[model samples]
Target: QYDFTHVPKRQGNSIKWGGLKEKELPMWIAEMDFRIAPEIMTSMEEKLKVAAFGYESVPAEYYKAVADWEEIEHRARPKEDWCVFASGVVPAISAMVRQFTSPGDQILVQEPVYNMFYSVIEGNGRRVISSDLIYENSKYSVNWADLEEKLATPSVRMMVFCNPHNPIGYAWSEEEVKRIAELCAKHQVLLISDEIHGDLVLTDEDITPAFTVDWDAKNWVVSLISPSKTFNLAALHAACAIIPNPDLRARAEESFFLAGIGEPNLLAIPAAIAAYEEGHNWLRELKQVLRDNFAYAREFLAKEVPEVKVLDSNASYLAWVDISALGMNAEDFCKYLREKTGLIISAGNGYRGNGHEFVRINLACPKELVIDGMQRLKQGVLNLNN
Candidate 1:
């Protein structure tokens, strides 16, 4: 029912589009090339017809939409009381960092992870401590012992987790999720799970939300979820913090309000409600498009640029392409691609763990765009080899 094939070109005021020069293709940022669900757009449009956009509280209907969506999509239904509104995941992260941890307290993360997690921590006067994920033979895995040791530190009070991690796309299993939460509870560490990518898993294996884990009454976890990624609603600025623990929920709610992250824009509630309530089929089609895009790039690059291996993943539309076989780091290679072919992909160096050897390609566009990107990638790699 949705058309993922023909996407309208992004115009003025888009950072992903405007940041690039004319004729440059951007497969770097997390935004998708496709438009959002018409259902969401219609909902926002209906809301726009209302005169005088004034102060409004988030309604029970909005939380019901969120709860229903979670139950349908991830098989876990959280209580409505457990939900707290946030403007965005990053904003909530910043607030949580500031409210929960003291200044100079260490915030733990699995590096070669999301870049925003680092910024949110350090941006809030907290220090970042990475328990880097182990990369071996083109796969990424967590170091449990290292994670535990880091969490056990007196100064380390928080750990931000990427559910089905980005840039590398390693989906943590249920057992892994439970153990991580249990460990955090044991060590008195607060676990902040960034599950923004939870809805985009492309494989048979399901991504576990942190709230769904067997917490065993230890509810020191907050699963940050949003429709930004799933519905191409980045500008919508709607997200929810699912905190099972009442004490933590109160603290998070207070922190979010104080940080100015709680107010819903006119579009936020309607757009989110429509998405969570009516976007199931649209999301299914979008995932199929992303899967096809990924497959095309994987097969094409395997033949055209043999040195670059696209990591097989079950989550997110981002392709973690291994360029280490070409004997070059990602920074220089990404620069080479842009200079040679106007192709802009993310250099993995910023993600910070064995990231220099890999590059991230966004494959959330139409197949035509993916083909163009693949051709450009092939040419860039071939030119480098020559």
Candidate 2:
């Protein structure tokens, strides 16, 4: 049995946990409050013993680690030459935006997405185009008609696709992935799929990567994957961009070189290797815990906090909660909860489009903390009613 009580307290100065007062229960960021797997810890320790922490080169082993991971998880054997290393997925997206298209080029992204897509696109002086996802019956679906229209635009050169989408988590099926690919191919638009949370799929459904989808020669696609969200190793800075076409890979490499995106930090290598190779059991157990927590959340919301609607999510540990019934904006509701009940959650306004009625709760913590936070929320709502 996993010892939830043994989970360490990350309260001192953790960016995920320490932003609020010490008494506040932080369920904001995606980082977990759990310990690293023993295998990963041992790998890092062994790497530290080498003691030569100079500018290290990307070894063949690193590439092999990535290939093995893809083969095992996604059932795809990506050519070693097509795998390009990056410091982080966000930076990779930003660089790809700058490299593939000219400034002011139109880029399409689904609304209520990982907000970084907006920053990466607009920050590079590109235009933001949206084909908002349809939220109906508590589930989110792609508006393919809108997407095709956006893709048909003469100036829309690229799209930032979020698979196993964030906020309202849904592990998209193979058909959905293929449809998007076909649209991009027909319109000659580049597809940059940010799949950082791919590894965190909590359900039993089959998820196909975008690269696996068939497309024409003119269609360009890049898939980003990392252990950051899965293993809680974002700070380690190890991520990869998988490009299938040689020309597209070359362009992405040029962009990386021009931006001076250098070698990943030394510590990240061993941890990533260990995570892909040896952390399967830990990941499975963690997923089970998250599943239980999700059920608990649904029950608690239904019974104790019925006004707060639980959004549908099949992947990631975040609970996208619609609190619009509270009659306040997301930021105001978050502030009220934090100040009145000492529970912190991510404000939905940060995500693009109409998320002002929502808030995201990180479930990567001990179950006790989950219960405590829910209780606090319940009490807070009751007090407000009174």
Off by over 4 Å in 2: 1-4, 9-13, 215-219
Candidate 1 residue runs with Cα over 4 Å from true position:
215-217
Tens digits of per-residue lDDT, candidate 2, 298-354, equal 899999888888887878889999888888799888888899999988889988666
Question: What would the per-residue lDDT of candidate 1 be over residues 42-69, giving only the tens digit for each residue?
Answer: 9998999996799979897988998999
RMSD in order of candidates: 1.1, 1.8
Residue-pair clashes per prediction, in order, are 0, 0
